[PDB]
């Protein structure tokens, strides 16, 4: 989609299975643990991450990028 | 050794081996192992009316000799005479 439309902001609300309501089977991290690079190669993607967030401390490591450190990965910060 | 006294002794031994085989139980465990573990048979051929021993060998193969026959990577081939005649007669069809 983004490759079809360069200058049109499209936000990826990547949630994970561990959320409420309707439900996916995937784990939260591993898909974004290996798609993040394929995304940031498009500046018109707002990367948003949900599924299980309750406080600042809960999601702060995802904000800075430190979450991928404990998964042996470059720090990958999210956009919201 | 002296072959003929050995014939004598072995005839005695076989005699009693078949004799008390009558009532003693069948240790098909240790046999099923030794001919499948020590000699590493590639073709077990069940000669019989129905494939009971072939089914008895596949389930001990998949169960206790799965890592083994992989680490060695054999084509451990199970055949009964009933159902596997072309593979034992070496007459497969094109």
């Amino acid at each position: 989609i983004a490759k079809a439309h360069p200058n049109f902001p499209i936000a990826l609300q990547w949630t994970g299975g561990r959320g409420g309501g309707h439900h996916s089977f995937e784990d939260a991290h591993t898909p974004m643990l290996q798609m993040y690079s394929k995304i940031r190669r498009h500046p018109n993607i707002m990367l948003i991450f949900g599924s299980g967030f309750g406080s600042a401390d809960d999601t702060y490591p995802y904000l800075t990028g430190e979450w991928s450190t404990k998964f042996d990965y470059p720090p990958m910060p999210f956009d919201g | 050794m002296k072959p003929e006294v050995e014939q004598e002794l072995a005839h005695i031994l076989l005699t009693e081996l078949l004799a008390y085989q009558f009532a003693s139980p069948v240790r098909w465990i240790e046999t099923q192992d030794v001919f499948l573990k020590d000699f590493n048979t590639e073709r077990v051929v069940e000669i019989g009316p129905s494939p009971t021993l072939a089914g008895m060998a596949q389930r001990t193969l998949k169960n206790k000799y799965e890592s083994y026959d992989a680490a060695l990577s054999l084509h451990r081939e199970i055949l009964c005479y009933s159902k596997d005649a072309k593979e034992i007669y070496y007459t497969p069809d094109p």
Partner: protein, 399 residues
């Protein structure tokens, strides 16, 4: 890049004698001449090159080239991969008008894979253009004695075809002395080879050779036993298009591809250990011996990860041990902070640079392929031209 990145490495010399003929013609002539001289002066390697190793005539008419059954073997390839790595090095030092020492003065450090590390430590001693050929000799003889002193330590024997045909429909190639496993951690492959080493004796045990990526590994061993662990992996198979998308994550079975690397000998295993002293004596038999005061740029260990300036005894000793006995921990040897990785190893678009890129992806490092001139659509890495661009189009920084 070391051995085993491409299938037909000799095709990368096609262009080199073809393209930069006026440029690398002298160097390839010198290399081939001293190399054939090595075959003559050595005791019994006249027998290990069954079809001879006169390479010059293999260049003009490809009909003079023996095929991969004789061309992919180690005692014939290991020098040729090194000369390819040296030729892609001379063409850029030349096209940038640099004496070897000049270009070397630019880098922060140089390291090699399985094989190329000798080429790196060789470059680290190069100062002028005339003082270059002594280093070329120093290098190429090391790889000539590694290939020979291994190919009799663990030669190739014909694999029983009962495996050659049973491996193709299993979507694999001819079993080669090394196998690559993806999407699998270093702990799990050890968990498995421990199950396979439990059965077989020491002379057929396998081990991990290259910790290539974090989820990309390579194990070595006899093609028989390697195909064996390939089998014992099939109990843990899952086809890649099975659509586990309707079963929870922890309930899924790990799918991952694997393939045999087009190699001819089990590098970084125990199977070659009996050759270490046999090459160490072969080197001191000749003049080849590298010293710390002779190199200026840091050169990193594939096993430790440290610089080869600091070493107890002869540096040339650990260099071979890193190619025969010790495994390579590639992320442990990439503990350097640099902005660009330009690779002169073999393989180009499939060589070492691409996997290094996939490892150091979100670290902001920018690999460029110093081997081939082509284009990449997304341009995650670079090519020949990006080495030579004078505009701002060359200095491209991946994020």
């Amino acid at each position: 890049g070391g051995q085993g990145n491409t299938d037909d490495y000799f095709e990368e010399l096609r262009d080199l004698y073809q393209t930069y003929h006026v440029l690398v013609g002298d160097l390839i002539k010198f290399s081939a001449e001293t190399l054939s001289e090595l075959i003559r002066t050595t005791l019994d390697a006249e027998k290990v090159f069954t079809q001879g190793l006169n390479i010059l005539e293999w260049l003009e008419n490809p009909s003079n080239t023996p095929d991969k059954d004789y061309l992919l073997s180690i005692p014939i390839s290991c020098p040729l991969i090194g000369v390819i790595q040296l030729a892609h090095y001379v063409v850029t030092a030349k096209l940038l008008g640099f004496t070897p020492g000049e270009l070397r003065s630019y880098l922060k450090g140089a390291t090699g894979h399985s094989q190329g590390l000798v080429t790196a430590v060789a470059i680290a001693e190069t100062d002028s253009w005339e003082s270059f050929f002594v280093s070329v000799r120093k290098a190429i003889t090391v790889l000539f004695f590694i290939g020979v002193r291994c190919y009799e330590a663990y030669p190739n024997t014909s694999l029983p075809p009962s495996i050659l045909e049973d491996s193709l429909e299993n979507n694999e190639g001819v079993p080669s002395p090394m196998l690559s496993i993806s999407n699998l951690t270093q702990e799990q492959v050890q968990d498995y080879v421990n199950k396979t080493n439990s059965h077989l004796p020491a002379g057929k045990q396998v081990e991990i050779s290259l910790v290539n990526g974090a989820k990309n590994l390579v194990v070595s061993g006899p093609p028989q036993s390697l195909y064996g662990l390939n089998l014992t992996l099939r109990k843990a198979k899952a086809p890649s298009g099975l659509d586990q998308s309707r079963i929870p994550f922890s309930e899924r079975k790990l799918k991952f591809s694997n393939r045999f690397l087009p190699v001819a000998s089990p590098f970084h295993s125990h199977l070659l250990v009996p050759a270490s002293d046999l090459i160490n004596k072969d080197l001191v038999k000749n003049n080849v011996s590298f010293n710390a005061k002779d190199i200026q740029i840091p050169v990193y260990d594939t096993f430790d990860g440290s610089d080869l300036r600091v070493l107890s005894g002869s540096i040339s000793e650990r260099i071979v041990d890193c190619i025969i006995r010790l495994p390579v921990k590639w992320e442990t040897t990439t503990q350097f902070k640099a902005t660009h990785i330009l690779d002169f190893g073999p393989g180009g678009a499939s060589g070492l640079g691409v996997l290094t890129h996939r490892n150091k992806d979100g670290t902001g490092v920018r690999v460029i392929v110093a081997g081939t001139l082509d284009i990449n659509p997304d341009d995650d890495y670079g090519f020949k031209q990006e080495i030579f661009d004078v505009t701002s189009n060359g200095l491209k920084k991946n994020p």
